[PDB]
Amino acid sequence: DPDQATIDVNNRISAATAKMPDAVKKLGVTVRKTSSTTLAAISMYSSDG
């Protein structure tokens, strides 16, 4: 389950935000669920210039 695993990592980041440098705390460690690959790639440009 992506969510059961996600909110299991969360319960370890906040659990270990004590053994943490103070400078990384202020900007906040971010946890998210997203694939390690790339699904697609869009390109936009000017057809004239």
Binding site: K19, M20, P21, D22
Partner: protein, 49 residues
């Protein structure tokens, strides 16, 4: 109070990284006083002048 916590208690200052860990900076006092009334004649704090 900042002088008070740094002499009889423990003042958490900041942190530094040594040997791959992250240590806090605590400021205690070595301390070898008779009584507490005698210890109050040994803790100084400057005025605004």
């Amino acid at each position: 109070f900042n002088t008070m916590n740094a002499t009889i208690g423990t003042y958490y200052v900041n942190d530094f990284s040594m040997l791959g860990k992250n240590f806090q900076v605590n400021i205690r006092a070595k301390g070898d006083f008779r009584n507490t009334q005698d210890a109050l004649k040994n803790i100084f704090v400057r005025s605004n002048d």
